[model samples]
Target: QSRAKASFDTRVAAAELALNRGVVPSFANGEELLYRNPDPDNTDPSFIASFTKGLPHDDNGAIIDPDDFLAFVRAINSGDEKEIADLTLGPARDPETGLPIWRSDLANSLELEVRGWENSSAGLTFDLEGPDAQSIAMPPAPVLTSPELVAEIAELYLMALGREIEFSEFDSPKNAEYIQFAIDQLNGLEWFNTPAKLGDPPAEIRRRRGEVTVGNLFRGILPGSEVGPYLSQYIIVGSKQIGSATVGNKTLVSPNAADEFDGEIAYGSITISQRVRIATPGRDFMTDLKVFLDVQDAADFRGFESYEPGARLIRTIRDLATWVHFDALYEAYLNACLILLANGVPFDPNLPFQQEDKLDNQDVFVNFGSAHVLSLVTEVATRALKAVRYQKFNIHRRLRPEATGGLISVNKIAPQKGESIFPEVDLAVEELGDILEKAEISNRKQNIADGDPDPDPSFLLPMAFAEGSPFHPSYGSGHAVVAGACVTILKAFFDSGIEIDQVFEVDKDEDKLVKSSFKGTLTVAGELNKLADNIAIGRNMAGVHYFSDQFESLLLGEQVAIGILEEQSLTYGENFFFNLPKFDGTTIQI
Candidate 1:
């Protein structure tokens, strides 16, 4: 029964039939690890990797208050909507407004959003035909003490140091000093130089000398062929309109500094010609992660009263992190689609409309044409978010980078609590000592320079946001999963093999989109992949997520999109198909 049918009963019966289609969704490898306590014995404090951000914490601000945390977790486990909703969590409130502030949608774990047409209940059941909210899973996040986790954290720290440098300058002589520093720091880490550990493939380890480069630094885990360019291309792939803006337009803006919002209610600004700002480069590092952690806990916490007129133009990774909504997340990709459509980029040959004879008939808004593809790009995002939320809240519950840094700081400052909580991870901190020391000095100097008599020399990871990461787990990132699903839809709808003719690079000093000096071909498929990378890694650049969070989440979102495409294929009478390259560098047809 289609919506095209007039009878109400017929539509209802059709919906019932779709719900009973008997497709069972399967999860990935980490299901058994769910709810398993990482530190069951209580002897190893460092092994406690569960996410407890925004909750009540001890004086050190590293360990969560066990009673409050258990109560919150118990409410979630009860599977009762009222219980989940009634619980008050987090540490702060708005001083003026006098309202409770907590992480966003803590109770969303017990809610359900139906897609295809059947009702869902509070027991965590769904009527969707594709992968339901609970069916998808990501591999267990790297243990907090492991080298892989340490390497990722160290990389984020380096990224913080280089946040002010424009992406366009990464490979040029302009940023040679910073680039060499980054390479040397990353190569010296044990994770980069060591062989693969147990249950790991030998190829997993990065080779030491001459391995790190400007092109690959801060890149995603996608195929090497896809990410080989100066970093600017990835940062600004879908940033601007195709024909309207020329090479010399100074229409973009970025944040002035990371500490722009520290004491001021209004955000500071700077005029930038580049499409996006570098991530988290600021003068003052956050002294207390708990301050923002409490802000995140409050549901009513608003970061700013108003943005400066110049700061209104969000043309940087920090800007993206600061402001996020479901619809806004896909705007750049949607613009990319429209740009391609306007330029007469060919649709995938497998699409039925592409085969139509132009003289007699052409698809305008429906049936494998513009409207169909555009709507589906946004359509898949809802399911992607729902799926990842289940992994975040119910399954993995991974801690954020800010929280990890807090733990590291606490353990380093005083180790009187017997064994080291993060024994294996200290090597990374030691290796990055110079960068960390320099960052501390810079932060203090910047604070004093800004007219503050008292300066904080704490070791907390400086955040891009005044309030820090969102009030949720940090396993599979929300932006990454959505990027995966939406970009995959775009890839499937368009011809992936076609080379994009007009490649543009941002000029850092001039802030203009100049024609590329790059000699290689930029294909539709690769840039789409890069766009996904940009949005996902953009979060990491802001110091909120880890490389694994974005990397594994992309794959998770890809799976969600594939299931959606597969199930939707059966509904169409035209025998249309979607063919695209997966993020893992493989091809799929649906």
Candidate 2:
């Protein structure tokens, strides 16, 4: 009975939204139309049959009587005169639950069905069941290089891991043949330009040989202009160089780093030029401000209606009056990095292996904390402006034919249930109106829905902002790019292993570590990586970003962060470019 009440209450809200929109649920059983809508007043039996099974039909194939259907609807609307009058159903009730059973479903169906409505006379032309109907298929992973070699090497590692294989032999060497075979395997691959040190044990050589698998090759790199094709699951043919000269079949570094390698002092190096095109407010400053405002507003609205505390903050601000999201996350992370760097402590490479993995030879942590901070502030201001400039250039030039389906795509699918405001929001969104003209974007990319043969007029998206400022191309997400950059910077300095089990306080007065002020502590739910993921993915949640936009954009941002780190490293002393095998399977110092 309680469940039935809950369900009815849910539909009632949707119905109210529809009522406000000047439409009502319309279908055989209107409940089914909550998401997709068919013709409402159709007398056709096949259309009716689609909604409900096992019904009698007349000469023209229409149901002989919809008497029980009418009764069921009325029963669901038992005492609501306003609803009964609007739906034109007589009052009645369900026999078992003795409640409104069909009313809410009916209203939701009508609201959903009326989505792409041009007028009252328009009807659904497409059939749900037909041989032509298509199913959504998941895109397959890209197969560039054959997996045989990769698989074979992985199996070798797996086998070695299973046995009592030692990094070194202390007393007796039993698997001398196996050890020699492993060294021979490493020497066999064309990927290595130089030969392996055969005298070295397997354990001493695992790091060099670890670059065998496909995932290892393309592990952490984000989609960049040069590397996006590999990330897109497509192969590109080209002679490519990472920094300066290419070494081996894989590794590449600047000339300086190569010079160091010859001296037996290995280091990474890269040349970076920061292009400051123009100076203006960064995209993040605007987006984060809006996010912070909306989050606070939503919290206030929720708090007022709920029985809980006066506020329901996901994470708290340390004695601050404002509820700014980025101010805490981004700002806090920056402060932590600066504080750690300013302490001028050299990194101890002798930490736990998992923790040490990130920081080793990462001696690149030069505390240009004082000078680099100024440069970063200037860089982001110009780069953010650069992002907007590129956004406009890409949208107008790249979109071609019809500018829609980005942040500019107006939503046809309205929000339902809860206190989601669409009609009122719609009013504001419509009033704010046109930023990108229709002549800019491609109709081909904007119109088609996967699997459905016909163009869905309903693949609409809600506006991210009411004023419509960031009306840009979403091919590569802005938030994601910023997230990638921000998170990467944080990762370089802070220990990802630190468990925050206490209430941390930030004194705006001091340039130091955050104080563990309060008494009690809650187990932290997420870390820097997860936090970055959330910030990037949050745009998708808000209906602004496509998945590809997010994945590729994040990598682009990380690339930016790497450049920033490289620049900062030089200020500290040596040009220590943190070298690693990029996510797209290439080794580069920068």
Candidate 3:
């Protein structure tokens, strides 16, 4: 009471009152959406059926109690190690083998989210290296009733249809008519042209009328680098050292017939080769789809051997999909870095090492040089994966495109059954009618080939892989996150404004790299951004992920890289700074 009479008494009262407010931290917006409104699990019955075959089932495969799953999620968020270790989420069993399905690094989410610097480290428990995983926010995924979800599935179907077509063929006479058809169909979708939707509209939507080119078929939202051709220059043109030999970007891939396997719980043999018979020339469109489906249900899915050693190149979307390794998602960007190094590309001018007098000395392998950059490129990947894993398992739990396709199939095949079980998803099923019809006809042809003489058509999305999507959830793709982090590290190290003198594109028919016809200045920053796009979108081409999964996760990974850079900057003794252009067109100086 006496202290309040002093001149500083008012300030003291204000401080005490503020302290008494008891402000507690909170998770980011939309982070708790699923927890609050936990109701019907947005999972497909077919997925449940396949996953629970050896475990438990009702008449329609009743596994995955929503309450039990929510409890597990809570344990993770609480950071109670004991509770997390004890709680088991719903288990997936292989349908044929009666063994548990392997969930990819499920416990990684619970691991302490830590980052190490020179002498000290930080994590969620204390001060974080960058933004906390809980602080970075992504919008809720498209609901099952939304037209946006259907449009995304429709695009997946279209991608599946065009999988075997070479990237270069989109502009050729052979595929021109079909390419035009795809563009028109995609443009007509409600989600593609709608404002404030996934399409990035106003200017980024697919052109309604165009020359039927790759530029019209695929569009991304990266500004200042948005108007490039389909495949990125880095993906097609880079050269890197593999073991003792130098290799171009041309990757050996599985044959067209080698795709679409059937056996349950089996990993299909990547029966790939440098030379195999291509699809029949001038085959009818439906016949091609039918062929894809026929192979989808082949029983004896066998053919495994050590990979052949050669310098086969990637020429088509199918080839890229076939070669994207299950592990080491950072390999592409790492190779890109090596290529840039071999080309004698200069470091960013902002680097302290680069500012050294030309007559004096320069960095070779140590600080601000190749060794530092290369190590950093790969070092950020684990952190990026951990960040995305929390989003995939703990937060979003978004279903894969394969599962959504199952829902669409059930809805069309048995309206009452599908509607009764999944009423909320009915709108999405309705919106996918056009694509469903095409899928049904193709499937029926496949059934006929599979010896079902009077087969009723099924609309299952024909999958590229034998086992379909991985056991993990689809949103916030692992590959895409790694791509984002690694590419960001590379961009920060390299001189982003340096123009590439030579540009190349894959010649599909020739199975080799060739000079591009277009004249435009290709810069380090633009190509690096494109490289990130290619690696991320490649998963979508495989039908395992959605565009949103790739697009948003890229920004998440970018954040991870930025955090690492900021923390590592303090570790260096010399004065150095990094000026980088972010994926979303923003600039940052660290």
Candidate 4:
């Protein structure tokens, strides 16, 4: 069995909670007179363990005398409730188990069939359809106690697990012992000793399956979705330089270290400019926070991806923090380019290659971390583009538009493909489901391994937060962008004018790396090169559609490309500039 752990809360709250629900076990055939004391823990000898197999026991190497248990059984069959309870509980049985099981009592179990989790993902169902005929668990054995009394007991149980689920207690064995004690006592209870021909329960337990799927707005927003298209999935085109002197792709995506474990370095160089550092916080300041990144890492390090460092992406406090978008973007691009080049997509020649592959220096990766930079061009320039889909039904009200008698499109708008908006070179992850599924096949570029010695074990994360505010960085700033992208993708399909259904892979330096953290122990920045390489597999497959399909893709990609180019991702570095002073002392010291 998965490791089981337990803890105790005060009894006052536990009892009160029991009474509020109007139930408790009172009809067991055991000898313990549990009628006067109702404990869900089944500590009374007369209490019965109704839901599972009998107590699991094992014999040690020491010789056992068969007569030892004989005495216990004699005491158990005495018929006196107090004697039975004492034999089973060792004299300290207060009835309720010290800890609360998800559904220790029949009523609470039933209540869970209706209630849910923190975000309320508890969409569980309850069913026990065995061959026997059992009544809908009859109104729980009535609780003949004052509400306040029961409330007191309930408080005791809730107190231990409230606020924070004692992380430390979960790893101890005391909890398991406590639960076992309650079960043994309940078994001794005389009221619960007898077995009955109780009927079978139904098959599905609503409480057991209570899992919350994607919210309505983002349910099916993807390339082939029927609801909306172009909601978030935009496209971009890669191009070669002509007159102006731009750093060759080699410098951008650097040499790939032979080790398959560390991350690979991205080559090619983008002319990064210097910016002022803004200060408002405490100590630890630095000058010249601006930098021209000459990025290098093992192929395994997946942190410092497209938009931010992997270390900062996973937490709430760090998520509120912000930084230079392109610093991360450019770094990610170099990583993606290396993967693109390594994949042997014969697009550009000057791409950096390994000392061994002798890859033709011709190859380039088109970036779309910003819609205004590239993705917009991929859409209009394409034969068709993807639109996001939305679930218009109201679940909170339990209202199903498709099944109910009402219009489903009232609060929703179908997307139009003829003319698209927002050409930033950003990931068009309208459908997180599709994105997640595709991620499986896509490469995991610049990922970190699980060997980092995190100084602060409690604060480490996968990536710097999504675009939000405050320190360290947080999740996406506003759901607006995420929501808009989803809506746009969905709207694409439902629109009458456009007919496009193709997936486009822009730069996913941010998201792909964020997900790599699932490995649990792998630090984001630990294996940058590997993460970059892996992420590239998915990044390039965004559409993986035929280039023949997006004949004008390069042309259309230019619109957003130019918008972002003018700013050159200037929008991102502002936050990093401001915080430079405080962190300069502790940072890697350039």
User: How good is model 3 by TM-score?
Assistant: 0.70
CA deviation > 4 Å runs, candidate 2: 1-312, 315-392, 395-460, 493-526, 567-572, 575-590
- Tens-place lDDT per residue, model 3, 1-590, is 57447435544443444344332232222322322221355542322211111112222222344444445446546656675555442244357754333322211222211111100011123222334444444445555555566666776776666666777777787877656766766666676655453654422232122222357464444442344555665555643222222236655332331111110110112221222123221111212222222111111111111233443455555555555534366866776676677455777778875754564376556778878888888878777776666666555656667656655565565654443444444666676676667667765665565455775556666554533455455666777878778878888888876887777666756756667665877788788887787777667766667777777777778877877777667556577687778886776876
> Roughly what TM-score does model 2 have, to 2 decimal places?
0.30
Name model 1 segments beyond 4 Å from true. Answer: 1-48, 92-129, 195-198, 201-210, 224-285, 289-302, 305-327, 415-428, 446-452
**CA-lDDT, candidates in order:** 0.57, 0.27, 0.54, 0.18
What is the C-alpha lDDT profile of model 1 across 1-590, one tens digit per residue?
A: 55666345444444454455433343322322222223557432321355665455554453454554555556645656676555555454446544443322321231211111011111154535446666666666666656667777777776666665566567768778977887877777767666466766322332112245666777766543235454323334332222322235553332422211111111012211223322233532344433433433432223422233332223333444443322265654565565456345677888775854664376646767777777778887778777677666666667777766665655454454454544444654566676667555655565565345675454566566544555666777878888888878888888877886667655556534556677788777787787777777777866778877887788878877887777667666675678888876788997
**What lDDT tens digits, residue by residue, belong to model 2 across residues 409-527?**
22212242123221212322232222111111112122221122343222122222221112233434455555555555544433323333422222223311233333432211123
Q: Which regions of candidate 4 fall more than 4 Å away from where they truly are?
A: 1-264, 269-590
Error of 2 at 356 (Å): 17
Clashing pairs in 1: 101-297, 101-298, 101-299, 102-297, 102-298, 102-299, 258-282, 273-511, 276-315, 277-316
> How should the candidates be ordered by lDDT, best one leading?
1, 3, 2, 4
Put down candidate 4 lDDT per residue, 194-233, tens digits, no spaces: 2322451211110011111211111111112212211111
What shift in Å separates residue 260 of candidate 1 from its native position after superposition?
32
Q: Between candidates 1 and 4, which one is better according to TM-score?
A: 1
